[PDB]
Amino acid sequence: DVPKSDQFVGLM
């Protein structure tokens, strides 16, 4: 699935 770094930048 999507990278965890995507969920971090998502909000950030």
Which residue, chain included where needed, has tokens 């930048």? 9
How big is the chain, counted in residues? Answer: 12
Cα–chain center distance at 5? 4
Q: Could you give the 3-state DSSP secondary structure of residue 8?
A: helix
